[PDB]
């Protein structure tokens, strides 16, 4: 008699990106590199108002000028991954190799690549999440709007 393990299958993950979704059609997405070096990004909006006035008793206003300095909002994300010290040992040792070292070493390479790979997937997803949560926290309910 025998146990007969069949085809050892695997998933391969759904390769999402926030540009690839429809969130970046609402997100003007900009890489910037001194963002750890910046504090709070200001924006000046210069705004004229119109000046329609008439009448004899009606209070005619002055020309009114409005600048508003609307601020940015930091909201960093951080996902953890981890690579085992056994994985680092079977990478950095690379000992007297009778092919069970080489299988294990290629496994360690694929382990680190798989972990960083899924980590970047998590990075994309987390950017999806915090962009969505910022839209929710700065989007009123539409009965209010």
């Amino acid at each position: 008699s025998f146990e007969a393990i069949f085809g050892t299958y695997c998933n391969k993950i759904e390769w999402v990106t926030f540009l690839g979704t429809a969130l970046a059609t609402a997100a003007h997405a900009i890489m910037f590199h001194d963002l750890n070096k910046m504090t709070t990004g200001k924006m000046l909006f210069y705004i004229q108002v119109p000046r329609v006035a008439t009448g004899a008793g009606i209070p005619t206003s002055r020309q009114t000028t409005v600048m508003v300095s609307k601020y940015s909002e930091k909201s960093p994300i951080t996902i953890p991954f981890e690579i085992s010290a056994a994985c680092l040992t079977h990478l950095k040792e690379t000992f007297e190799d009778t092919l069970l070292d080489k299988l294990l070493n290629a496994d360690a390479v694929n382990t680190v690549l798989r972990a960083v790979k899924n980590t970047a997937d998590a990075m994309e997803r987390g950017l999806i999440d915090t962009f969505l949560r910022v839209l929710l926290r700065h989007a009123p309910p539409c009965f209010v709007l």
Partner: peptide, 8 residues
């Protein structure tokens, strides 16, 4: 369209 953001 002429009374947007207008005092009157």
């Amino acid at each position: 369209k002429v009374y947007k953001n207008t005092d009157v």
